[PDB]
Design a protein around this ligand. Sequence first.
Ligand SMILES: *[C@@](O)(CCC(=O)O)[C@@H](C)N
Ligand SMILES: *[C@@](O)(CCC(=O)O)[C@@H](C)N
Ligand SMILES: *[C@@](O)(CCC(=O)O)[C@@H](C)N
Ligand SMILES: *[C@@](O)(CCC(=O)O)[C@@H](C)N
Ligand SMILES: [Zn+2]
Ligand SMILES: [Zn+2]
Ligand SMILES: [Zn+2]
Lengths: 340, 147, 340, 340
Amino acid sequence: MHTAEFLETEPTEISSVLAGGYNHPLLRQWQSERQLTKNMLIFPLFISDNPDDFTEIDSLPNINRIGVNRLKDYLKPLVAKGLRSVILFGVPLIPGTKDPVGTAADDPAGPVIQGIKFIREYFPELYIICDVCLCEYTSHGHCGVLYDDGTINRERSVSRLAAVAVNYAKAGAHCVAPSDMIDGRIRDIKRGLINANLAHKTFVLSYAAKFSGNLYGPFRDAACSAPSNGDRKCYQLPPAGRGLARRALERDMSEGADGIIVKPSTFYLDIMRDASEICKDLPICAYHVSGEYAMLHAAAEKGVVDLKTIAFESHQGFLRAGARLIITYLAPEFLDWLDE
Amino acid sequence: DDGTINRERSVSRLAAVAVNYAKAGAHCVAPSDMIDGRIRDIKRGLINANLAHKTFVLSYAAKFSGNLYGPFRDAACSAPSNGDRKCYQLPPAGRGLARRALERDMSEGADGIIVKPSTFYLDIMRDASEICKDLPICAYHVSGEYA
Amino acid sequence: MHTAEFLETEPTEISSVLAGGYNHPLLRQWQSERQLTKNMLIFPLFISDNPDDFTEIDSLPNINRIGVNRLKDYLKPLVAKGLRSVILFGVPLIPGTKDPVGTAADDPAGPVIQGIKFIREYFPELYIICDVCLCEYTSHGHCGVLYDDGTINRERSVSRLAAVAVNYAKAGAHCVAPSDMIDGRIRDIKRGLINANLAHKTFVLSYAAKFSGNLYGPFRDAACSAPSNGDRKCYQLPPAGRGLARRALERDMSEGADGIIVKPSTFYLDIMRDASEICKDLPICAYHVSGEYAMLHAAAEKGVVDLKTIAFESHQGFLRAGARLIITYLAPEFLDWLDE
Amino acid sequence: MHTAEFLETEPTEISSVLAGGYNHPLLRQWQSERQLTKNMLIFPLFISDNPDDFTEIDSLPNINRIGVNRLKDYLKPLVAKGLRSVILFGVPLIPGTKDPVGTAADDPAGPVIQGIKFIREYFPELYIICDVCLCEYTSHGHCGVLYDDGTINRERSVSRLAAVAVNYAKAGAHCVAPSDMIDGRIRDIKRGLINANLAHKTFVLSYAAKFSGNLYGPFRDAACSAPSNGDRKCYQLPPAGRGLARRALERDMSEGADGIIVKPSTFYLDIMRDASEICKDLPICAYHVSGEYAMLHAAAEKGVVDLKTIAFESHQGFLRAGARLIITYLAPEFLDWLDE
Ligand SMILES: *[C@@](O)(CCC(=O)O)[C@@H](C)N
Ligand SMILES: *[C@@](O)(CCC(=O)O)[C@@H](C)N
Ligand SMILES: *[C@@](O)(CCC(=O)O)[C@@H](C)N
Ligand SMILES: *[C@@](O)(CCC(=O)O)[C@@H](C)N
Ligand SMILES: [Zn+2]
Ligand SMILES: [Zn+2]
Ligand SMILES: [Zn+2]
């Protein structure tokens, strides 16, 4: 007969015994270095220039493009359940709005500044963040102003972006979040705010480590921000580029960033850990991007995972890796779940 | 009897299984049990069997409990029973426990380490790259991640 | 009888046992922190101003000086086997070309810019690096512009070098690699590229740690770059000068270097290890120099070592010490060997 | 006309200027963190069991196999010129001496103990180091005692090696240098010396980082130590194995090593730099091995380098990388050169 063999063993070494720390549900909470709370949540809003818009974005489940006259009814139950912050994206659909220099980016009649004004009046306690970039406003769809050869013009781009950021601040945004990745734009935006007497009021939340890759699919359908001729791989960081990311984090801190965003999130958790050392004195924010979010939904609907469960797992993952803030399309679900 | 794991009897049984696989010809043994101190016992086992100089010990040092093992439970028909794996698999928030587990398994004889799952635990790979800088680090792209 | 004595021993300590990690051929691969691949290879080309040149360089085995009308037939099998990058050196032999300010360094009719133009057209996927210096173009053979007392004039040298580098970039080089070692030249080259709207397109690969010594013998016969009155020991680093090397690495990083070269290679592996910490976020490149290469051939032909074997040993040595790139005269051999 | 272009430059930054530190011959000495002196030199001796031997070793230039009755005349001019230390290797050529357990390794009639006795009497101020291994004494040529399957038996090997080391110490060696690389042998040798009341008198100089590779060619002809069936790659470290080397250094320190050797030397300078941190409180020794030495001679005779020059360059390289001791076949040349 084959029988169960047991080797002769030595007495347990105290150094081997970890189990005393996680044998009860409360202990698995004690073991967290940071717990998820409501105020860590930042919810994106896609504001249409059709004020009566409330259009579902196919590829981004449960998320709509919304006009200003639909915003009160949408935000009311969210703020009531504890929402503290939103990040605005403009989606102007009126024709002849987009041009090579992203003129409409800071149009006082455009959806972002209209959205700032509405929110400041109707939800005066909500903290408003605005994405700062030109890609939703350029005819070529790229994030900066281009030379003739289709490459980005750094100087003209950062000049245009500094203006957009300051103008959002002038209109009432509390926070500007430059997502363009163009070399040195944080310096120029910070100087811009200083010259406008707004730097002591305006948090600069840099997307310091934003990577190029396959996880932005459905975003390109909600904000109608698709490039044109070439790719984003010359300013967005290459996925293998840890050294570039570490240098970008150091740079943006140096140039005035009050906080930093790592994007995407789950697939870049090691870069959050890198940022937690490089940017240890600053808030670090995870951006759970469109492709990551849609991936979770796809897997959940296929029976691979449980949506709430894997929501909690991934979002606790951000906190473990060093983030203390989360931009996420699941904020409405969490405002309910964190009650329970 | 109370359905909790018996450490001493478990590591004794696991050391035997590992040595017997090595005896049969495996080049490498990869203990996935997460039970406290099993690497020490497996390494001593191999030493006593004159196989430690031939057998790579690839510890699953940082293996987390969670929602990503669904389809594995259908390919290897390895489903628990009464209770969960959360008392030996690490809690997903447990970075401190993971760092201590990495240090422990290195100390106890691991030639290499596995972090599992992978994508959702990339920060723990980065932690391991410092703690276990002189050892090979292995990522396990698990069933739920793949699916 | 003298008999074999065996001392009484204690049971094996687990801490003593390393052998489980390297007892199989695959494990000796697992133990490498970086494996050699084709794309890490950079092959030097010595371009003649006689367009029909294909002259073997005596002291540098299997390496020729080549004119442009011979380049297609030479590069074709190499690119076909996976060559990704070349580094160009100009060897103008027409008389009355060399002068005290290295005027011909950026002659649009000279071999480097002619070689850039040819390569950009015939091998549009090849990544082109150009050595930047004046020594192959000066009548005195030194790397910079000189004062009357034969010492290098820093200001005039860096001004001239910045121009040469920008002009190579203007002509099409993807990468400029300043090999002059003159204090502060990286700053001036980077500013030059910025002013020319080329810094976002041009990798700056500094020879940051280039040492004076006995290993450049045969180079002086392939590029006809011999000094004159004095030696290179006042700008090339002294071989014992670790402190100077560490400061040079930090300096060039600060001044804009995208990557760094350590030269020579094998005899300076400790400096690669130093650079891997100081320049941890940048690519580090090893230059397997003429004397090192010829030394390997000499020893192999004498039966001391096996050429392929010691090729692999030395080049894996670079990777172990922290390099991720290699400039080597054995690139053609490796493009075959890495297949096997 | 193509004219020499000079870009507009900014005033020199003080941070760019390194040149003030190395513009004079004395400064290039000031820049060394460690200068080469005579007492750092350790010269290998290959002692024959034919007492009248003085046989040149073909592949190892200017080096002989020597019997005891030839040692006085050979060592006299060397000690007179400042030689402080030797490392002994036994080459027994009498038939029927080698056996599977290396019985003759510590034969009181064998060349090592005869050489210790002679040196202790005729050169009482010379510091004597003995290589400790079994490979020059085993019939299979491997460094330890083997299982039947030709693999090394750790326990029996370390037991045999501890005995050999203690017996050399008993005979008069000041220092034992275990070159076997078998897991845990330093612990056993140290315990051996402790039990023999010799640990307070006996320096343990571990070959802690000894790599497998192509640089031991001519050694295999001077000490007639060739393996048999299989290779040394299961105990000697793989050339890519930095992690294993770092762990071996830490291990041997822990187990009692008073000093450590890195071998080979030039091709492993990065590992010397690693050892200088891990083993910062211990003497580090470079072993300029047979293949490295013969490589220098081959290149020098081919005109690639100058022998004295490249001797100084490579040996200063060891000191730069952190060694303070050198085992070298060029010790006789240096005892003359360091005068000049
Ligand atoms: C980002 O790439 C979009 C986020 C997403 O895809 O969900 C920039 C445009 N903020
Ligand atoms: C692991 O949890 C299974 C891997 C997978 O789910 O793919 C252990 C059982 N090796
Ligand atoms: C270098 O010193 C030459 C390389 C070699 O000798 O092979 C400079 C001139 N790039
Ligand atoms: C070493 O490998 C030999 C040195 C040399 O080859 O010169 C051991 C046997 N000490
Ligand atoms: Zn954009
Ligand atoms: Zn030069
Ligand atoms: Zn040996």
